[PDB]
Amino acid sequence: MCLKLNLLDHVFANPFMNAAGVLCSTEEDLRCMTASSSGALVSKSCTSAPRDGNPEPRYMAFPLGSINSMGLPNLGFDFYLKYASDLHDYSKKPLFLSISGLSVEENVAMVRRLAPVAQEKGVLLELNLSCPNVPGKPQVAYDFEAMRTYLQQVSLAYGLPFGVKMPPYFDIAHFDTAAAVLNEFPLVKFVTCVNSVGNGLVIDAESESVVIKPKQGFGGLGGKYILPTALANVNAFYRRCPDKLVFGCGGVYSGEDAFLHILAGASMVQVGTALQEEGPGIFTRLEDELLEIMARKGYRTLEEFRGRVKTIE
Amino acid sequence: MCLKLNLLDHVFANPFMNAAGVLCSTEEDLRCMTASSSGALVSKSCTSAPRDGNPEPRYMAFPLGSINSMGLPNLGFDFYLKYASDLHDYSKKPLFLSISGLSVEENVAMVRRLAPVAQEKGVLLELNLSCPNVPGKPQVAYDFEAMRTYLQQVSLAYGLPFGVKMPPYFDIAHFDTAAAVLNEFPLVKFVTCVNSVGNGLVIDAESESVVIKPKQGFGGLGGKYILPTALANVNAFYRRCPDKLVFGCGGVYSGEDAFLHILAGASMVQVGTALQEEGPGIFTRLEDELLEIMARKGYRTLEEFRGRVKTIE
Numbered sequence: 001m002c003l004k005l006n007l008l009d010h011v012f013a014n015p016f017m018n019a020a021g022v023l024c025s026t027e028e029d030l031r032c033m034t035a036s037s038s039g040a041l042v043s044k045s046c047t048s049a050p051r052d053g054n055p056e057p058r059y060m061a062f063p064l065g066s067i068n069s070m071g072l073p074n075l076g077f078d079f080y081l082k083y084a085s086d087l088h089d090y091s092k093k094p095l096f097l098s099i100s101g102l103s104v105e106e107n108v109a110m111v112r113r114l115a116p117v118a119q120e121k122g123v124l125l126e127l128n129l130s131c132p133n134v135p136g137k138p139q140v141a142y143d144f145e146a147m148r149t150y151l152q153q154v155s156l157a158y159g160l161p162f163g164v165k166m167p168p169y170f171d172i173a174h175f176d177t178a179a180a181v182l183n184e185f186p187l188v189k190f191v192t193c194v195n196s197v198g199n200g201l202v203i204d205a206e207s208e209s210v211v212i213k214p215k216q217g218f219g220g221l222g223g224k225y226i227l228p229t230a231l232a233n234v235n236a237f238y239r240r241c242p243d244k245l246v247f248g249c250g251g252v253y254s255g256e257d258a259f260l261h262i263l264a265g266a267s268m269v270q271v272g273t274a275l276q277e278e279g280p281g282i283f284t285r286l287e288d289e290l291l292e293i294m295a296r297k298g299y300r301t302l303e304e305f306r307g308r309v310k311t312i313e
Numbered sequence: 314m315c316l317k318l319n320l321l322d323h324v325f326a327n328p329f330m331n332a333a334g335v336l337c338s339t340e341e342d343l344r345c346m347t348a349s350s351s352g353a354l355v356s357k358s359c360t361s362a363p364r365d366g367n368p369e370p371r372y373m374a375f376p377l378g379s380i381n382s383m384g385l386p387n388l389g390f391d392f393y394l395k396y397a398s399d400l401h402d403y404s405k406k407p408l409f410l411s412i413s414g415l416s417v418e419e420n421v422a423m424v425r426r427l428a429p430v431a432q433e434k435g436v437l438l439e440l441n442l443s444c445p446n447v448p449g450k451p452q453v454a455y456d457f458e459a460m461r462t463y464l465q466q467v468s469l470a471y472g473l474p475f476g477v478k479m480p481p482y483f484d485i486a487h488f489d490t491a492a493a494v495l496n497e498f499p500l501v502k503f504v505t506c507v508n509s510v511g512n513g514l515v516i517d518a519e520s521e522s523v524v525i526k527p528k529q530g531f532g533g534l535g536g537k538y539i540l541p542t543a544l545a546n547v548n549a550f551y552r553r554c555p556d557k558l559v560f561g562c563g564g565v566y567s568g569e570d571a572f573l574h575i576l577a578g579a580s581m582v583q584v585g586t587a588l589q590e591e592g593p594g595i596f597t598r599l600e601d602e603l604l605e606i607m608a609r610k611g612y613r614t615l616e617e618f619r620g621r622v623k624t625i626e
């Protein structure tokens with residue numbers, strides 16, 4: 001019985017990795033993730049310049065999940081490129097680098113410079129589309145014309161297989177349109193579903209206050225709140241993009257939650273909130289729990305059940 | 314101390330009512346809700362003709378909430394209008410009738426008939442902008458030009474104060490655009506935030522199956538999953554629509570959860586999943602729990618704290 005996968009011309013001990021943004025901002029964070037039992041890691045979404053991000057408090061967690069408005073704090077592209085080019089030990093596990101430029105030209109400039117490191121060292125790009133463009137317009141993946149522009153420009157500039165991190169959708173028309181846009185781009189080889197469920201509001205009853213400072217308390221939701229939303233998006237894109245991989249992200253706290261993602265169609269399974277709360281020891285637990293479910297069911301590999309969710313009659 | 318309030322030229326014993334679709338489809342159901350301690354009730358969203366809805370199973374509930382693809386099963390508009398005109402006892406509490414025609418023309422036709430019953434009896438209209446998926450077209454509330462048409466046509470056909478049931482939004486630009494649409498219509502006097510979080514997917518690990526039959530398992534989410542989403546929408550529209558009431562719906566299982574909705578801006582608080590799960594006794598509990606929290610805080614009225622959620626610096 002084994003959790004091994006081979007995808008995107010890389011080998012993964014297991015499907016688990018951090019979600020972008022969690023335990024991956026600094027060198028220390030990345031070394032931690034690399035030392036962990038995860039199958040892979042992804043770096044913090046970066047911009048060309050370093051950013052301090054929003055004022056604190058900007059992340060809070062509770063029994064059913066988390067809310068954040070971090071504001072994209074990161075050490076800048078050059079740092080993450082250096083990590084990929086010179087610091088990461090590729091013999092431990094594969095690395096993904098997430099980018100989240102604030103404009104199409106910022107993304108273009110970064111992927112141009114990432115390309116030769118991707119070709120030589122095998123770092124994999126995750127382009128964050130669940131991200132701001134012009135303020136007063138919707139996030140890029142909620143603006144299908146902007147999304148198409150970003151993918152056309154990045155595809156031309158980068159020229160290598162990459163993946164995309166998508167926000168959740170809630171309307172079948174959006175699943176259809178979004179997948180049709182992605183399917184225009186043969187270099188988009190993986191689709192990570194989902195980013196945080198946007199602009200939730202957590203309020204603390206005793207203090208009568210929101211719990212994060214930015215944006216009058218509005219921020220993206222993760223964790224137990226979002227698992228059925230995550231599963232729906234994984235399955236919706238799994239069905240609509242048969243020549244791409246789907247990576248699942250959202251609501252994973254247990255090997256059972258991971259097994260659901262994989263039944264829905266997930267290849268890799270990313271862990272955000274639960275990892276932020278539990279720490280990297282979660283990866284040994286999740287591996288053990290998923291293997292126990294597989295043993296009970298007589299499954300020896302992930303492919304035996306990936307995308308095999310049953311429908312009713 | 315009592316929770317009675319006056320809105321829309323009606324008196325309410327308390328701010329609680331059922332969510333449209335729950336405990337409100339048949340004459341039995343409407344009599345049950347009338348006999349409950351709720352402050353008001355709303356009927357099942359109706360179409361001009363009766364509908365059987367989708368194949369079963371089409372609703373399921375879990376510790377953290379529910380998923381449904383009911384398919385607008387309903388007894389038809391003539392039935393609900395007859396209930397409003399002849400059967401309902403207005404001395405007990407106010408009645409809202411929810412309409413969800415499958416086209417603008419259907420909604421126009423129904424509202425032209427409701428108008429004199431609204432004048433004579435005081436039934437209130439809640440216009441549901443959500444409908445079964447039509448391939449190629451987004452939900453009405455997610456297509457701002459369609460939304461503007463519906464509201465223009467209904468406002469003209471009806472001529473009296475009404476409200477609108479909204480799905481959730483997840484992007485600040487969308488809040489801005491949606492509220493600006495709504496603010497074009499002075500007869501829209503209340504906005505109910507929110508309908509179920511669309512197209513989630515619940516999977517059972519043991520059976521490896523989805524749990525509802527229609528739509529390959531995809532359905533709207535209610536319950537604990539959606540409380541922060543619901544609060545964010547309530548507050549976003551409370552802030553943007555100062556000349557309107559906001560009715561909160563989503564994730565209410567306790568007087569604390571109701572308290573948070575009211576803090577966010579809610580005038581009435583609607584209860585769906587929890588009501589479906591617990592039954593109509595829930596209203597006496599929610600009333601007791603909300604009065605208990607008020608008493609611990611020193612609040613004597615709902616107006617003292619409605620909309621008064623605090624932000625940080």
Ligand SMILES: Cc1cc2nc3c(=O)[nH]c(=O)nc-3n(C[C@H](O)[C@H](O)[C@H](O)COP(=O)(O)O)c2cc1C
Pocket residue numbers: 019020021022044045059066068070072098128165194195196221222223224226249250251252270271272273274276
């Ligand atoms: C503190 C924090 C920072 C995040 N930063 C990023 C980011 O930089 N890029 C990104 O693609 N997603 C980011 N996200 C989203 C996560 O990658 C993940 O999509 C989301 O939290 C849902 O997964 P979960 O339910 O396991 O938390 C962040 C989430 C959290 C909680």
Ligand SMILES: Cc1cc2nc3c(=O)[nH]c(=O)nc-3n(C[C@H](O)[C@H](O)[C@H](O)COP(=O)(O)O)c2cc1C
Pocket residue numbers: 332333334335357358372379380381383385411441478507508509534535536537539562563564565583584585586587589
């Ligand atoms: C079984 C069921 C049927 C519903 N039918 C309707 C409907 O006819 N009209 C409507 O506006 N919303 C309908 N809804 C949505 C609810 O009114 C409510 O917006 C949603 O369930 C969120 O509230 P909750 O978290 O309390 O369940 C339905 C919900 C459920 C669970």
Ligand SMILES: COc1cccc(CCc2c(C(=O)O)[nH]c(=O)[nH]c2=O)c1
Pocket residue numbers: 021045068069070071072073100128130131132195196220
């Ligand atoms: C630039 O300000 C931003 C506002 C919202 C989202 C983002 C992208 C980064 C990001 C963040 C973040 O850094 O806030 N949090 C998430 O949950 N997902 C994300 O993708 C940037």
Ligand SMILES: COc1cccc(CCc2c(C(=O)O)[nH]c(=O)[nH]c2=O)c1
Pocket residue numbers: 334358367381382383384385386413441443444445446508509533
């Ligand atoms: C599958 O049937 C529908 C899909 C979307 C919307 C509607 C309208 C009635 C409705 C329903 C329903 O009857 O399925 N369920 C909801 O959670 N909200 C609603 O507004 C039906």
